[PDB]
Design a protein around this nucleic acid. Structure first.
Lengths: 125, 120, 167, 23, 106, 196, 122, 183
RNA sequence: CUGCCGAAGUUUCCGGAUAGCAGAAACUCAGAUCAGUUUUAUGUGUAAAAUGAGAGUUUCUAGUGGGCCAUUUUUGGUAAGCAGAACUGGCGAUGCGGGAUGAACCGAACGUGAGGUUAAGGUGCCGGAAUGUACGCUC
RNA sequence: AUGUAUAAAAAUAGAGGUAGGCUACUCUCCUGUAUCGUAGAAGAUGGGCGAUGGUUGAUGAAACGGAAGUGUUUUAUUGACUUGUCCAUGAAAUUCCAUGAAUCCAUUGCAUACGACUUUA
């Protein structure tokens, strides 16, 4: 296995008002619940159910039950931010978000982009 | 009544007895045939020596009624290929001989005399 | 969702008892009306204090003082069965006394097919030391090296590809 | 059924079961 | 070739009914891409039409159309209720409907 | 969410009841459904329990002319079609039309082995059945009740896998070429800010 | 339908809109505001073209009291082409300065497979 | 319980791979393959140790951990040492005639209790049959698969069954005498 | 042919007279009396605040005088059923939603329609409605 | 019908690779909200610039597809179009939604209540 529910694991919230955010399991409650926190101010420290999160492969050292400030301090020290973005999974998710917020004019420019990209279709014989 | 495995007791839908099962194929055995067609003529009675070990008429003779079937040699006029499918055997294609005798050409026509003899 | 309520009441003052004792209970109910009703039923069944001759002097909702800290609660209960006489003690690990009560009601109704009326809460305490923690699963949750794979991972019908259903 | 016997019961049979439960 | 279809596709599922009574006046329409009653709030008030063909060449045309209006969502799965000028025939259960993008508010 | 003219469903690893209920709704919706690999369907419960189920189903027969009783069909496609049919108003013209808009086949015939085969997430065994629980397969169940084409379908599917895998290798090699030429053009990275 | 058009001004009820006639051949027309999808494409200058001339009476049809008659040769009056040509002359520099707008306005919008209007942002 | 694990240390056996739950153990004696797809147990391979792990399993599934551990240990013993079963012929009046064919893979038994029937029993794959010279009327069953060897011994004993006679007096038959390793 | 009003479904005395329920005619009554109701007080009964409603009588003239089902109390019980009362209900004069189907079960009581919202019961498919959410039990 | 556009396989307490020598690497998964395709009087008329490709129509083919192969390729041409990047004309008053055999008649008896069936002509 590559993913384990353990203290110090970074998780991605999937269901709820915090969908798409990154959190870290500060403490573990039981087989069905977990307590998480995030350095971003918009994400409060809260208890979540395991169905709402997906375990990311990134695990960072974290003492059990650390307060929000020290969690942010450890987060900045170990540079979890942009370490998640280094993964191809994050790039796909961010690209999906950018595609979602595109308007009609941007989509037209995309068509011209890929039409010019398709123009070459040149390969060695 | 009789056995329930033979009902519904109705007329056979064919004058010629159709084979419903052939012996299982074997690659070890070389290529041969399995069935033949003949015409019943009648039977007689014959006297035959009984070489039946353990029987009470061993090394003796008995009288047996035996049916005589005339079997003139059969002419191979074609071949049919069968392909196994998830819905059973299926006739993939049929190849006939170039020249067919009038005996087998008469089969395709109800009135061979009035026909234009256009088969094949 | 349940809400913890502090309920204080007494009988109506009278020349016999000009200063009746104020009885206070900590009981859980969805709303105030249910909490007062359960209080009066308990007071009648314990101190034989009539609902008619009494009145309610104070009602206050109680919030969890430390709702962000994982805790283990031990709950004493007097469950009613076919014989209508039982008493058990159960331990639940969670972050709110309300949550432990919520878990206990769901558990008892799931196993013994109990109801809110068949259940009466006897005492709720917060067991803080691993020494007093008794249940095996609670102990295996307070182990320092707790880690395990996530179980039960699980419109847009007609998915084109097979699910990963793994990591 | 599937076992040997129909789980579904006759309407007069259900009522007399209710009557037998009452007494 | 794909420079047309300014409309969203939909299917006429059934009438608005109880277990035993049908009300043919209002029809349940499954607009595709819609997945919730919150999503159906976008398609409220749009113009849904039923395009079919007949033998006669009325106005020199083989194709006739029954217009209609999306009224309100129906259920949690994103279906909608539509009121057509002429109530749709019972033979159109499962047929295709066209939900135009007008009257637009986007 | 969407529809096509014809939907091909790869019934491997699906559950008989869950898939049939989804299929029956799609047929009443007006879509044409083709369920391939019907012999690879799964049913909850262990093999012996399901075999006794069908056997007991075989017991359903009249005294008068058993040819007038319930016709028991042994093929896995016919088993699946019976499950779908009981979920349809088959005594009405609307129900009869929906049935005719469905084609259940064992394995994958040639007209459908060169088309994309979608799967139903709501009917998949790996998502619906708790791990370690006993489940049977309609192919083994059918072949024990009297279906007599298990081996040939297994052989024909082996050939289909071999031919299809060779096609995938050709397409993957082509995909490798187009992928290499994808980022070769600088225009891809010029304004990829739109997420493409 | 499906033509991308530039809005000149808002009338009492309709929008007096016209695409650059040399681009997509859309003359000055009243269009009801419920039959228009307002895209978030970058704005262009409209303050430089006179629009007070376009009135409800100006767009109004004559009385009723033939198809070879009328037609946009005989019944399309000369001055109408003069405002139309003037509008294109006043609008072309803006769409020339900002990239892809001439190409964008020439193209026609249409939905494709898997396109959901309730999610797509215009 | 959350965690239930059994640890096994591997001997000098070459390969103990459990890819796709298919244990394919290659040792000095040979290579044995078995399928453990009927048990939902994690098979962690790290260095010289193999962990059979079950998370949140019931007692019925938890009992499979030790059973899996033993059978894997048994087959590992087979690829390293092998299994050998010694059976002694027992006859009162009629000597039991035993002949070996295809280097012993099939045993046909005659002259049992005076019966003229030739009982032919084929051993399971991975087993060979030999006649011991040190001890008379001795049959040796050696191979890699303990289950196959034991099943072959059980089949031989079951075939040579005395019927309709008093067991207390009639003792004719073939029975297992010694079970162990090759060395 | 349409419209309006609309029961009794049984006491009490010898087939009935009576009463009761339904109407009509003619009277007086609004600072008045009533009530399938609840409080208060005196010792379950009696008497006087709450709430609702306009409240009374006299004449005379139709129809009704059965039963069924169920609850509770109680009398015995009895292999076990049940049997005897009382009690007010439900049906009976009455369609409708649900209970797969139904004299007695859960809702609901009816002019013709449009829209909205619910009851009882439901939301895998037949079948309108979440193959919803959360926690357990079961092979 | 309105793009009627999309063919690996298996596992799910795991797979697929890439890069290696059945074993040592690291990467990817976590659904398609993807990919292909999509500017043009239902798509007009010319002119450049830059590819030297793409889309096809009609021929001529050869290789492949049997499970229901009724379709996959490779192509040799020929006829078109090309938006790959720029230009110049045209649309409109539709001046605010509507879209050769068989049968009968005969013949046979291998058949038969009557039809049917087997023959012959």
């Amino acid at each position: 296995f590559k993913r384990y529910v353990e203290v110090g694991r970074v998780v991605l919230v999937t269901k709820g008002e915090y969908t798409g955010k990154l959190a870290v399991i500060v403490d573990i409650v039981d087989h069905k619940r977990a307590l998480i926190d995030s350095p971003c101010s918009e994400f409060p420290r809260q208890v979540i159910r395991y169905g709402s999160v997906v375990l990311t492969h990134i695990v960072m050292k974290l003492p059990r039950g650390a307060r929000s400030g020290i969690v942010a301090k450890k987060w900045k020290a170990q540079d979890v931010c942009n370490k998640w973005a280094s993964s191809a999974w994050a790039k796909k998710l961010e690209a999906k978000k950018v595609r979602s917020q595109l308007n009609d004019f941007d989509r037209f420019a995309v068509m011209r982009l890929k039409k010019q990209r398709r123009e070459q279709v040149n390969v060695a014989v | 009544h009789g056995s329930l495995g033979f009902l519904p007791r109705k007329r056979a839908s064919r004058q010629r007895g159709k084979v419903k099962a052939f012996p299982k194929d074997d690659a070890s055995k070389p290529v041969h045939l399995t069935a033949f067609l003949g015409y019943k003529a009648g039977m007689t009675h014959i006297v035959r020596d009984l070489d039946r070990p353990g029987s009470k008429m061993h090394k003796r003779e008995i009288l047996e009624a035996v049916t005589v079937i005339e079997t003139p040699p059969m002419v191979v006029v074609g071949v049919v290929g069968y392909v196994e499918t998830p819905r059973g055997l299926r006739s993939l294609t049929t190849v006939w001989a170039e020249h067919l005798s009038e005996e087998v050409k008469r089969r395709f026509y109800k009135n061979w005399f009035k026909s234009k003899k256009k088969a094949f | 969702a349940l809400k913890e309520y502090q309920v204080v009441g007494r009988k109506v003052p009278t020349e016999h008892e000009p200063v009746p004792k104020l009885f206070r209970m900590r009981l859980f109910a969805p709303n105030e009306s249910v909490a007062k009703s359960r209080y009066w039923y308990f007071l009648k069944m314990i101190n034989k204090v009539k609902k008619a001759t009494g009145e309610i002097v104070a009602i206050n909702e109680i919030s969890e003082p430390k709702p962000l800290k994982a805790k283990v609660f031990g709950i004493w209960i007097r469950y009613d069965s076919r014989s209508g006489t039982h008493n058990m003690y159960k331990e639940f690990r969670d972050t709110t006394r309300v949550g432990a009560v919520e878990a206990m009601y769901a558990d008892m109704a799931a196993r013994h097919r109990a109801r809110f009326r068949s259940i009466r809460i006897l005492k709720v305490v917060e067991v803080e030391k691993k020494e007093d923690v008794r249940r095996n699963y609670v102990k295996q949750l307070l182990n320092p090296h707790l880690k395990f794979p996530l179980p039960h991972r699980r419109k847009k019908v007609f998915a084109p590809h097979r699910p990963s259903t793994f990591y | 059924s599937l076992k040997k016997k129909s789980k579904r019961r006759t309407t007069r049979l259900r009522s007399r079961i209710e009557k037998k439960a009452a007494e | 070739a794909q420079g047309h279809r300014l409309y969203v596709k939909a299917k006429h599922l059934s009438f608005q009914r109880s277990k035993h009574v049908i009300h043919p006046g209002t029809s349940i329409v499954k607009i595709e891409g819609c997945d919730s009653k919150e999503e159906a709030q976008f398609y409220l008030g749009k113009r849904v039409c039923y395009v079919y063909k007949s033998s006669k060449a009325v106005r020199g045309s083989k194709i006739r159309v029954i217009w209609g209006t999306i009224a309100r969502p129906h259920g949690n799965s994103g279906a909608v209720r539509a009121r057509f000028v002429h109530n749709l025939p019972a033979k159109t259960f499962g047929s295709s409907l066209r939900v135009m993008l007008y009257p637009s508010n986007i | 969410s969407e529809f096509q003219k014809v939907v091909v469903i790869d019934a491997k690893g699906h559950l008989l009841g869950r898939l049939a209920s989804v299929v029956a709704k799609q047929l009443l919706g007006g879509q044409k459904v083709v369920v391939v690999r019907c012999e690879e369907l799964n049913i909850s419960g262990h093999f012996f329990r399901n075999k006794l189920k069908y056997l007991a189903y075989l017991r359903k027969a009249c005294r008068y002319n058993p040819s007038r009783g319930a016709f028991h069909f042994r093929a896995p496609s016919r088993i699946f079609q019976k499950a779908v049919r009981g979920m349809l108003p088959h005594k009405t013209a609307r129900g009869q039309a929906a049935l005719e808009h469905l084609q259940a086949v064992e394995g994958i015939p040639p007209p459908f082995d060169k088309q994309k085969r979608v799967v139903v997430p709501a009917a998949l065994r790996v998502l619906r059945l708790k791990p370690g629980r006993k489940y049977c397969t309609v192919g083994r169940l059918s072949s024990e009740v009297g279906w007599k084409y298990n081996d040939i379908v297994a052989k024909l599917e082996e050939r289909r896998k071999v031919k299809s895998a060779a096609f995938y290798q050709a397409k993957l090699a082509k995909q490798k070429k187009i992928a290499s030429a994808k980022e070769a053009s600088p225009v891809n990275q010029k304004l990829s800010q739109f997420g493409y | 339908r499906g033509k991308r058009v530039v809005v000149l001004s808002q009338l009492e009820d309709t929008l007096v809109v016209t695409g650059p006639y040399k681009v997509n051949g859309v003359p000055i027309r009243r269009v009801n505001h419920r039959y228009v999808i307002a895209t978030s494409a970058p704005k262009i200058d409209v303050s430089g073209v006179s629009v007070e001339k376009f009135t409800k009476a100006y767009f109004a049809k004559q009385k009723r009291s033939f198809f070879a008659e009328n037609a946009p040769k005989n019944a399309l009056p000369a001055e109408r082409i003069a405002d139309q040509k003037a509008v294109d002359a006043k609008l072309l520099p803006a769409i020339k300065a900002i990239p892809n707008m001439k190409e964008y306005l020439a193209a026609s919008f249409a939905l494709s497979n898997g396109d959901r209007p309730h999610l797509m942002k215009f | 319980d959350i965690y239930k694990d059994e640890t096994l240390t591997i001997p000098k056996g070459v390969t103990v791979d459990i890819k796709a739950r298919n244990v394919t153990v290659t040792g000095p004696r040979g290579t044995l393959k078995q399928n453990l797809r009927h048990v939902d147990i994690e098979m962690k391979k790290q260095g010289n140790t193999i962990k059979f792990i079950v998370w949140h399993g019931s007692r019925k599934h938890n009992a499979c951990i030790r059973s899996v551990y033993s059978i894997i240990n048994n087959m590992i013993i087979g690829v390293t040492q092998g299994f050998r079963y010694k059976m002694r012929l027992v006859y009162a009046h009629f000597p039991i005639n035993i002949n070996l064919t295809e280097n012993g893979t099939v045993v046909e038994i005659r002259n049992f209790l005076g019966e003229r029937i030739t009982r032919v029993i084929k051993c399971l794959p991975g087993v060979t049959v030999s006649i011991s010279s040190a001890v008379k009327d001795e049959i040796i069953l050696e191979g890699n698969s303990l289950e196959n060897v034991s099943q072959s011994a059980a089949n031989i004993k079951q075939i040579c069954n005395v019927r309709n006679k008093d067991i207390r007096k009639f003792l004719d038959g073939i029975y297992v005498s010694e079970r162990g390793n090759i060395e």
